[PDB]
């Protein structure tokens, strides 16, 4: 049924993402979400694919939804901060990278981001 099929779609999406097939990844994750809309990982993965396509608004929306489902999803904050930085929403980006560091203090991407964003906030 739907939940099990949703996971197969996620796996196909992951393989597409690993092969840099960002649009095919979006398509599979979109089907995964249609089949099961209550899994934060599907939204967070779809945000990842959207980032590589420079679909920053869609990435941001997916990250916000992922957080609604699971507020401790670290990658949702990293990805949303990335999108927000692209969209020159620097204080919001810095807030997301700061939250990622609350959840995961050793995260190097987020540490690097905070240093870079100081000049804009």
């Amino acid at each position: 049924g739907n939940m099990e099929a949703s996971e197969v779609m996620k796996e196909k999406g992951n393989a597409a993402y690993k092969g840099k097939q960002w649009n095919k990844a979006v398509n599979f994750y979109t089907e995964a979400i249609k089949l099961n809309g209550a899994n934060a990982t599907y939204y967070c993965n779809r945000a990842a694919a959207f980032l590589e396509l420079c679909c920053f608004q869609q990435a941001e929306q997916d990250c916000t939804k992922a957080m609604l489902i699971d507020k401790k999803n670290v990658k949702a904050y990293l990805r949303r901060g990335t999108a927000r930085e692209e969209l020159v929403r620097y204080k919001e980006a810095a807030a997301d990278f700061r939250h990622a560091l609350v959840l995961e203090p050793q995260n190097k991407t987020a540490k690097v981001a905070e240093k870079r964003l100081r000049k804009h906030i």
Binding site: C44, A48, R79, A100, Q106
Partner: peptide, 8 residues
Amino acid sequence: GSKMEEVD
């Protein structure tokens, strides 16, 4: 830990 470039 959390590699942004990897999906889950």
